[PDB]
Amino acid sequence: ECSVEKVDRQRLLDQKGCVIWVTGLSGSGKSTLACALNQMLYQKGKLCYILDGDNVRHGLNRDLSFKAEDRAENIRRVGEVAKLFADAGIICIASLISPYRTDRDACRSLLPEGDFVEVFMDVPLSVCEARDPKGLYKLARAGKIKGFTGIDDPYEPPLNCEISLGREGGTSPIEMAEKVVGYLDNKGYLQA
């Protein structure tokens, strides 16, 4: 143990470290929400870092597939990394499909109460598939991708998340980010 503590890092950054865990089907707007939130927090002088499922999967998790056991390990490792970022005082935004409740719950358990903010992109499959920005649903339908979440692999929504976004429609990435920032501000995470 070193003399420099988490509260020292928070004092330096004037914010509190935490994990914003963004979960949802492909196409539910996780990544655009993460980017909008990051931009908004940056402009307020707060330091964020995004752990994106796809990106981490080309580095730390390059060894993992999409078999259920590998998704569990993917989520577990991201959870541990996010905890480290939080301990460093960073507002860490994890954005992964993260389809299994038990695995997201395990990530929550790694952190002190209040430090893990589960954010659900509450968007139905039909809307996600109509967007299909990356053509993944198209690929899954054409049979190229087996066991695609929402098609032939399960997504289990959060039963008690802190924030639920996107259900209404005609709500923008920026408006949704504003809701998250408002929540963080009220919970006291935006000042030491």
Catalytic residues, by residue number, are 98
Q: Which does 132 bind (CB under 5 to 8 A by kind): a second copy, ligand ADX, none?
A: none
Site residues for ligand ADX, 24-53, by CB under 6 A, read: 26, 53
Going by C-alpha positions, the residue among 81, 80, 91, 88 that lies closest to residue 115 is 91
Which distant-in-sequence residues (6+ apart) come within 8 Å of 83 by Cβ? 19, 110, 111
Q: Does 147 bind ligand ADX (CB under 6 A)?
A: yes
* Residues between 34 and 63 with contacts to a second copy, criterion CB under 8 A: 34-35, 38-39, 42, 45, 47-51, 56, 59-60
Report the C-alpha gap between 173 and 187 in whole angstroms.
Answer: 21
Nearest of 149, 152, 157, 144 to residue 27 by alpha carbon = 149
Contact between 97 and 155 (Cβ < 8 Å): yes
- Hey, which residues does 95 pair with through a beta bridge? 22, 52
104 is a site residue for ligand ADX (CB under 6 A): no
Say if CB 12 and CB 92 are below 8 A apart: no
Among 68, 72, 106, 110, the residue binding a second copy under the rule CB under 8 A is 110
Question: Which of ligand ADX, a second copy, none interacts with 149 (beta carbon under 5 to 8 A by kind)?
Answer: ligand ADX
Q: Which of 113, 88, 117 is nearest to 13 (CA)?
A: 88
Is the CB of 69 or the CB of 113 nearer to ligand ADX?
69
Asked if 74 is part of the footprint of ligand ADX (rule: CB under 6 A), the reply reads: yes
166 binds a second copy (CB under 8 A): no
Residue with tokens 């709500």: 171
Chain contacts with ligand ADX (rule: CB under 6 A): 26, 53-54, 57, 66, 71, 74-75, 96-99, 136, 145, 147-149
Annotated binding site for substrate: 54, 57, 71, 74, 97-98, 147
